[PDB]
């Protein structure tokens, strides 16, 4: 079972030092509780130098593998810092009791790779322009090793 895909936009405003992440949609999500309900939400972490700086999260959508969010989040990242930060995007399954299991995650920014690096580079190259892209979710074990 594939993990699924996440669509989000990035926008950077250098003068104000404002980084905006809009969580748009996820699709094809893996069903986490077999025979149960899939209730996805998205977490965003801002990191620098391997440290978690800020956490935000979306609302929870109920009983879907294809949630639509369209929820915007902004971070204060000055222009002398933006090239060294990471933005981690994780889709999780909400449960009222018990740890919420991650479906998968991706990150953009410093040390990112592939399409995530291209997305981030496009944001940096085009101040003030929102750039939306899809990304394939990856198992947390692998992304977390990159981020540690």
From Swiss-Prot:
UniProt KW Ribosomal protein keyword: no
Record-level GO cellular component terms: axon; chromaffin granule membrane; clathrin-coated endocytic vesicle membrane; clathrin-sculpted acetylcholine transport vesicle membrane; clathrin-sculpted gamma-aminobutyric acid transport vesicle membrane; clathrin-sculpted glutamate transport vesicle membrane; clathrin-sculpted monoamine transport vesicle membrane; cytoplasm
GO BP, one annotated term: spontaneous neurotransmitter secretion
Binding site for Ca(2+) 4: 33, 39, 93, 95
Residue runs in coiled coils: none
Main location: membrane
Disease: Baker-Gordon syndrome: An autosomal dominant neurodevelopmental disorder characterized by infantile hypotonia, congenital ophthalmic abnormalities, involuntary and hyperkinetic movements, stereotypic behavior, poor or absent speech, EEG abnormalities, and global developmental delay varying in severity from moderate to profound. Behavioral characteristics include sleep disturbance and episodic agitation.
Protein family (similarity comment): Belongs to the synaptotagmin family.
Protein name from the UniProt record: Synaptotagmin-1
Organism: Homo sapiens (Human)
Chain's gene name: SYT1
Full-sequence range covered: 272 to 419 of 422
